[PDB]
Point group: D2
Chain length 272, copies 4
C-alpha cells in the first residue's frame, strides 16, 4: 500500500515521505513584511532541511464589516508573489474565491487553494479543476473525514488529479474546535491515499500550537500548514492564531525530530 504522490515542482508531497511545510503569513499586508516573513522561513527551512512552500492570502472574504481591509487584490497580489519567487526561489500557495481567479493565479503560483466555506462549490471547483494546477482542499469543520472522497472525485472529473487535503479541526459544540487525530487515516483511505496535511494554526481559531502540532506529526503526515507573525500580540485580531517568528526554528526542530522518527517506523498492525 503505497501513498499517492503529488509533486509541486521539485517537491514531492506524500504521506510516507518527509513532511513538507506550507508555512507563511495570513494576509499580504505589505511586501516589506511579506519579504521579512518569507525571509525567515526559507533561512530556517534551508538550514534545517525541510521542503517549504510559502503561503499568503491576497484576499479576504471572511473579514467583518465592509469598511475593512479586503486585501491587496488579485491584480496587485500576484505581483507580490513574482518578486518573492525571484528573490527567494520558493513556491507560493494562495487560496482564490471566485471561479475566474483560478487561471490567473495558476500561472503566478505553484499550489492554489480551495477554502473550506467553498469546498462544496461545484462551479469554483470545476474551474479550479481546469487549471490543472495542484490543489489543497481545506476540510470544512462541519464535514466528517470520510466524506472527503466526493471532493477528490469531483476534481478527478474536472481532469485534476493533483490534490492535497488539509485538516483544520471539527466543530465541538458552540464556538470551538477539536482535532480528531483519527480522521487523518480516514482521510488517507477514502482519498486514494492522497497527501494529508494539518493546519495547526486554524485548528486553534496560543502556547498550545506546539503540543498540538507535535501530536499531529506523531500520527504521520504529508505536511504541516502554519502561519506566523513578527508581533502576534499587538497585531492580534481574529480568524487564526499565528506563531511567533522568532520561535519558528526551535519549533520546527520539534516537528522534524518527530516526523523523521515516525516516518521511519516498521509498519505496525494493531489490527490483529
Amino acid at each position: 500500500m503505497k501513498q499517492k504522490v503529488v509533486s509541486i515542482g521539485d517537491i514531492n508531497v506524500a504521506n510516507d515521505l518527509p513532511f513538507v511545510l506550507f508555512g507563511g503569513m495570513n494576509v499580504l499586508e505589505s511586501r516589506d513584511l511579506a519579504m521579512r516573513i518569507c525571509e525567515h522561513y526559507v533561512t530556517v527551512t534551508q538550514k534545517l532541511g525541510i521542503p517549504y512552500v510559502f503561503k499568503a492570502s491576497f484576499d479576504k472574504a471572511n473579514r467583518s464589516s465592509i469598511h475593512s481591509y479586503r486585501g491587496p487584490g488579485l491584480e496587485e497580489g500576484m505581483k507580490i508573489f513574482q518578486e518573492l519567487k525571484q528573490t527567494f526561489g520558493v513556491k507560493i500557495i494562495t487560496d482564490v474565491h471566485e471561479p475566474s481567479q483560478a487561471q490567473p493565479v495558476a500561472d503566478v503560483v505553484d499550489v492554489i487553494q480551495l477554502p473550506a466555506f467553498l469546498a462544496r462549490q461545484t462551479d469554483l471547483v470545476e474551474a479550479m479543476a481546469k487549471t490543472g494546477a495542484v490543489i489543497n482542499v481545506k476540510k470544512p469543520q462541519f464535514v466528517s473525514p470520510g466524506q472527503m472522497g466526493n471532493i477528490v472525485d469531483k476534481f478527478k472529473e474536472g481532469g485534476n488529479e493533483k490534490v492535497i487535503l488539509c485538516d483544520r479541526g471539527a466543530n465541538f459544540g458552540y464556538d470551538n474546535l477539536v482535532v480528531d487525530m483519527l480522521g487523518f487515516s480516514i482521510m488517507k483511505k477514502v482519498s486514494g491515499n492522497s497527501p494529508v496535511i494539518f493546519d495547526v494554526t486554524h485548528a486553534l481559531q496560543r502556547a498550545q500550537v506546539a503540543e498540538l502540532a507535535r501530536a499531529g506529526m506523531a500520527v504521520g503526515l504529508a505536511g504541516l500548514f502554519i502561519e506566523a507573525h513578527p508581533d502576534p500580540e499587538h497585531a492580534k485580531c481574529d480568524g487564526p492564531s499565528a506563531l511567533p517568528l522568532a520561535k519558528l526554528e526551535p519549533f520546527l526542530k520539534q516537528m522534524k525530530a518527530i516526523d523523521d522518527l515516525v516516518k521511519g517506523f516498521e509498519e505496525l498492525d494493531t489490527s490483529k
Copy 2:
C-alpha cells in the same frame, strides 16, 4: 420590547405576529411540477389562513459530481417564477450564489436568500445589500446563534435593513444535526429582534418533521420554512428531506393551532 417587522409586500414578518410559511420545493425540476406543488400550498394556506411565500431553487451548487443537474439556470429560472406570480399571485423566495445574480433576481422575486456556506461572503452580501430587497440569512450549522449579529450588521451597512434569520440546526458530532430550541431567543436578541424562522426540513438532513416543527412553533417564531414533494420515496436523494404534499394540510393545522395558541400568551418571566 416590540419585534422588528420586515414586510414582503402585503406580508408582515415578525416574531410576535402570526407565523408566515415559506413553503415550496427544493429545486425547479419542471414547471409542470412547480405549478402542481405551488398549487397545493396556496389552496391550503388560503383555506387555513396562513401567509405564504412559495420557495424554490433555480440553481444548485451543493450537488455531487459535475455531470449532474445544475438546475434550470438563472435566465430560465426567473421565467418560471413569472408565470407563477401571475397564475397564483403569491410571493417567490429563491437563494442566489454569485454577486451578479443578486439584482436580476431582486426584480423577479420578493425575498432573496443567502445560503449558509456563503453566509460569510462579504462580496456576495454587499452585492445582495445593494438590491435593497428582503433577505433571508440561513444560519450556518457551524456558527453559534449569538454570532448572527455580524451578518445583520454587515447588511445594515450595505444599506439593507430588511432581514430574516433562518435556523437549520447545529453540528452535533460527525454527520448529524440537532436543533437547539434555545438559540431562537439568542438570535432574536442579538438581531435587534429581527424575524427568526425555522427550516425544519433542512434540520433533518422523516416521520420526524412533525414532532420537530411542533417544538419549533411552541417556542414562538416568525415563520416556518419547509419543502415537500408529491412522491418523496422514489424521488428521494439527499440534501434535505421533503414533506409529503398530501399531508401538507393536516400538518399545517398542527402549526396554526400551536402558533396561534402561543402567539397569544400573557408574556411570561421565569427570569425572576
Copy 3:
C-alpha cells in the same frame, strides 16, 4: 400502537394521557420550606387540573468539597415525606444512591429514582428492581436515546416492569447541554413505549425554562419534571436551575394549553 401505562397509585403515567407533573424542590433543606413549596404546587395543580407527584432529594452525592451539606439523611429524610403525605395527600418521588437504601424508601415513597451517573449501576438497579416500586431512570447526558432499551431490559429481568424514562439533555461540546427534541420518539420506541418525561430544569444546568418546556410539551410527553424555589436569586448555587414559585401557575397554564391541544391531535404520518 398504544402506550404503556405505569401507574403511581391513582395516577396513570403514559405518553398519550394528559401529562403528569413531577414538580418539587432540589434538596430537603428544611420542612418549613418543603411544606411551603409543596403547598404551592398542590394548590396550583389541584386548581389547574394536573396530576402531581412532589419531588425532593434527601441526599446529595454531587456536591463539592466534603465539608458541605450532604442532606437530611435517609433516616431523617423519610420522616419528612411522611408528614407531607398526611398533611397534603400527594405522592413523593425521591432518588437513592446505594443498593441498600432502595427498600427503605420504597415503603415511604411512591416513585423512587435512579440517578444518571448510576444509570449503569447493575447492583443498585437489581436492588431497585427488587422493591417492585415504580422507577424513573434519568437519561445520562452521555448516552444516546436509542440505548435506553438496555436499562429498561435490565429492570424487566430484576422483575420490575414499571419504569419511566427521564430526559435531561445531551452533551454539546465542553460544559453545555442541548435537548434533542427527536430523542423522545427514539426513547418511546426502544422502550416498549414506556412513559417519557422531560427534566427541563436539569437540561438547563433562566428566563429560558419556559420556551424550552413549551417545546418539550409540543412534542407530546407523558410528563414534566421541574424544580422551583421561593427565592432563586440569593439561594442560587449550581447543579440545576430552579423556577420562581410565584410563577408556577402562569407557567403551568402554558404547559396544559400545549399538552391538551397536542394530546388531542389526529395521529399524523409525515412518514409517507
Copy 4:
C-alpha cells in the same frame, strides 16, 4: 515550574519523567490467563526499559443484563493479585465501586482507581481518601478538562494527595468519542501539575490504537494506560478494545522512542 511527583513504591510518576505504563487486561477472567498476560508485559517492559503497573478488574458494574459475568469478586480477586505480586514482583492497579471495598484493596494493591461514572461520588471518594493510597481518577467523558480541580481538591481534603488523572476522550455527538489533545495541558495546570495519563483503549470504545497513542505521547505525558488480549477477535465484546498481545513490544517501542525524544526537548514557548 516543576511537576508534582506521585510515587507508587520505587516508581515515580510525573509529567516530565519518563512515561510509566499501566498496562494489563480488562477483567480477571482466570489466573491461567491473567498470569499469561502479566507475563508478557513484564518481560517486554523489563526488556525495553519502561516502568510498569499491571492492571485488571476484579469486578464489573458496567456489564449488560444481571445474568452475566460480574467478575471474580473482591474476596476472590484480591487473592489473584497476591500470587502475581510474588511470582512477578510488579505493582497492581484495580478500580473499586463501593465505599467499603476501598480499604481491603488498598492493602492488597499499590494504585487503586476511581471509575468515571463515580468520579463525582463524594462518599466513595472520601472513603478512598482515607486509605491514603495512590489514586487514579478516570476523567468522565462528560466533563471538561478544566474541572478536574474539584476532584483533586475533594481528595486533598480527604487527606489524600497522591493522585493521577486519567483521560479517556470526550463525547462527540451520539455514541462516539474524540480525544482533545489540548485537554492534557489544561488538566496539568488545574491539578497542581499532578500526573496525567492517557487511556488509549478506552478512548476507542482497532488498527487505530497506535496512531492515537503516538499522538498522545508526543504531547508529553506521565503515563499510558492500555489493555490487551491474546485473541481480541473471538473474545471481542464491548466496552473497551484491547491490543493484540503479540504486538505489545513493537507498539511500545513506538511509545518510548516518542516519550524519550519528547521528554527531552528544550522547553518551548510559542506563547510569545
